[PDB]
Amino acid sequence: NPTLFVSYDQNGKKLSFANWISVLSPQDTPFVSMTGKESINQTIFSWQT
Amino acid sequence: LFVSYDQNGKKLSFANWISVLSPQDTPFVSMTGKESINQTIFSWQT
Amino acid sequence: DALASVDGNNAHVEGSRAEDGEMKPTVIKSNVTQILRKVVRVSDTANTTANYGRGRELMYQLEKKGKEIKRDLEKILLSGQARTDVLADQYLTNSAADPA
Amino acid sequence: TQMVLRAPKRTELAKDGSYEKWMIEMEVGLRHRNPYASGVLFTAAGK
Amino acid sequence: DALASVDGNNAHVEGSRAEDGEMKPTVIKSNVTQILRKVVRVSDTANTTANYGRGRELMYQLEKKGKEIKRDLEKILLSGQARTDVLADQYLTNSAADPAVAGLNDTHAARKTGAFQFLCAHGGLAGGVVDKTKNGPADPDTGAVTVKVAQNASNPTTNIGFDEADIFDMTLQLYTAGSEADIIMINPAHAKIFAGLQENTQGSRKRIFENTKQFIYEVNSITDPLGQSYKIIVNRWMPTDAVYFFRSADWTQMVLRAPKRTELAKDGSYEKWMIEMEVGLRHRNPYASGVLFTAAGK
Amino acid sequence: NYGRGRELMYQLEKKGKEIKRDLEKILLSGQARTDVLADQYLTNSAADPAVAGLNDTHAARKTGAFQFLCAHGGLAGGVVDKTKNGPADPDTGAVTVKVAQNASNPTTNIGFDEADIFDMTLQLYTAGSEADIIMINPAHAKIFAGLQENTQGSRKRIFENTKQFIYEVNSITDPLGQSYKIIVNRWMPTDAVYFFRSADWTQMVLRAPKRTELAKDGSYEKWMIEMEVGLRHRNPYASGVLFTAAG
């Protein structure tokens, strides 16, 4: 029941909900982008040198 | 690990109305009557 | 909200500077929900055999407890219990929930 | 008024054998316009 | 919000059950607005005359004030005030109200916005302004520090500037966080630094001239060792104690009450007017822009 | 409620990206090959007799990272050692795993070498490696820009009446004619430098990442993501690793 209307005496204060969320975590992954993928069928693979 | 107690941007579910029980009957005034005047002081005789 | 108290002596002068007066803010009332839960654990071993004394045990039991939750809801609403929660004074400054 | 967050629904759970479990849950609350809009009268004494 | 830094070396067995992960919620920011005002008062007599090089004394004085308010705005948004306000922990106001300061009146203090420095990763405060003698913190997920106190160890104590190498250190911090800053706003008094990249003790891209009739001595574009091309911009209203690394899209001006016409009472040969507008400032992420303070050398 | 719609799909996306972030970091971390099997390829007798019977009580597995698959020359526990130089190639006289000597830049600062880097290109040229890339953490990219013109003296990098500033080096030419290409990696460790070639490394995929909803048994609504992959390296001496050590 404020006599002098101000912002600090209002029982309302309907908050302003932004329509976005900020994120900066990058996912460049330069190595994984240049390696190449080869499908296998065993948990262990071997090669000779 | 997400649970309802951890949410932050909770869009509140506020009610769009206000209730007040303050009566506004005023019975006496609704039975006395009104007579317009043009002065700050009135008088009668008995 | 509620109107101001009756000022039975709000007599002013014929001509004077109008004063600010007085006002009153609103009052917020908050409540919290409750979780009502009912489950069933009827097996199927005795359900595979064709018995004469019983037709079903799953759908019938669901309806039984399907009505109990309502028969319990009313008992809870009309109860004299107290609201239980730990999110007090977290509505207008609720920008972030209680970190603790 | 009856404030409901989750309406009634018969949910089915996992099957770790012949258990055959089920679930019925709902989430509601209660709202009152003004505390002084309704009245309560307690009736009790010593014992 | 930001992803989790639990990367580590997660290794799981083949025949286990899904164990509960590590979930973290978001983080809410909040800034308050500030009230700008410019008053005008001119006696009716002076407003009735006809000046020898203009029209009425009212509109002319109003236009002069309508421009000063914009200058005051540019200087405040780029200041380092600490968002002076009385409220505290009342943004998620949903469980109750704040009657602590409700029985008050215009006696309330003056509200202030969160300027460029306060909205960034500031390390501390100085009562009402951000403290430049403290190095800001680091992001939880990344390890970037967008608020770095220049060392200036390269240059001597005679000239102050901020540094010549500390400019490249911020680009590393921004890239480390993932910011897309591409602008370097600077005070004109410090432009001699970005142009005067010399005095590096005989090294590091010093200088040369091919005896030409053109002498520029200016640096507008910059590229860091990582490839982030930056463009230097000068702002007359910027302070001379810090440099800003930011992006236009990562900032917005929150306007609540726009400037409008306000005719007030007279009270006798006053003809009073007023200008007023409430505005705030926003920042998508404190770690999306850099602030390079200035300090002496060795 | 208002404002806060859902946190299930949002969290799935967050986790969908985090799993990839970890992969780029694990392959370049330098962990050690972990497994419960050993020398079970030439006995021509059986897979393993002594490991059978344990259903899920086994220990986790680890893939040979960039360092393990190279001529590391010793381990410091669960991760490759960053101090002991790799073993010299028997055929050639190459050493692809070295340690920065830190000649200049006194011990006041860690100071990754900034010099003698052409030695590694020599070790590679001596080993027939066709390395053409130098993956490095951005925290040490300035050392390559200063390689342009610092030389602790008068080399006089020039302006030529220009306003554009570059001070960036991304390509180098070894004295032996080997032209390399510098690349920045935010997930690389701040104490290593990888000289290699893309074609010499392959990604062995066994279980591609896929979402799978699990049982509820209540209001849990549990979800998970899982992927099984490995790393391959044709020849250890086909790539090099240069650590950083002050003193």
Residue numbers in the entry:
A (entry chain AW): 3 to 51
B (entry chain BK): 6 to 51
C (entry chain BN): 52 to 151
D (entry chain BN): 303 to 349
E (entry chain AK): 52 to 349
F (entry chain AW): 102 to 348
Text taken from the publication that reported this structure:
Escherichia coli phage SU10 belongs to the genus Kuravirus from the class Caudoviricetes of phages with short non-contractile tails. Here we show that the virion of SU10 has a prolate head, containing genome and ejection proteins, and a tail, which is formed of portal, adaptor, nozzle, and tail needle proteins and decorated with long and short fibers. In contrast to other short-tailed phages, the tails of Kuraviruses elongate upon cell attachment. After binding to the host, SU10 tail, nozzle proteins, and short fibers re-arrange to form a nozzle that extends the tail.
The prolate capsid of SU10 is organized with fivefold symmetry and is built from 715 copies of the major capsid protein organized with the triangulation parameters Tend = 4, Tmid = 20. The major capsid protein forms capsomers of two types: pentamers and hexamers. The closure of the caps is enabled by pentamers, which are bent in contrast to the flatter hexamers. However, the formation of the prolate SU10 head also requires variation in the shape of hexamers and in the angles at which they interact. The major capsid protein of SU10 has an HK97 fold, which is common among tailed bacteriophages and herpesviruses. According to the convention, the capsid protein can be divided into the N-terminal arm, peripheral domain, extended loop, axial domain, and glycine-rich loop. The major difference between the capsid proteins forming hexamers and pentamers is in the structure of the annular loop positioned at the tip of the axial domain. The capsid of the genome release intermediate of SU10 is identical to that of the virion.
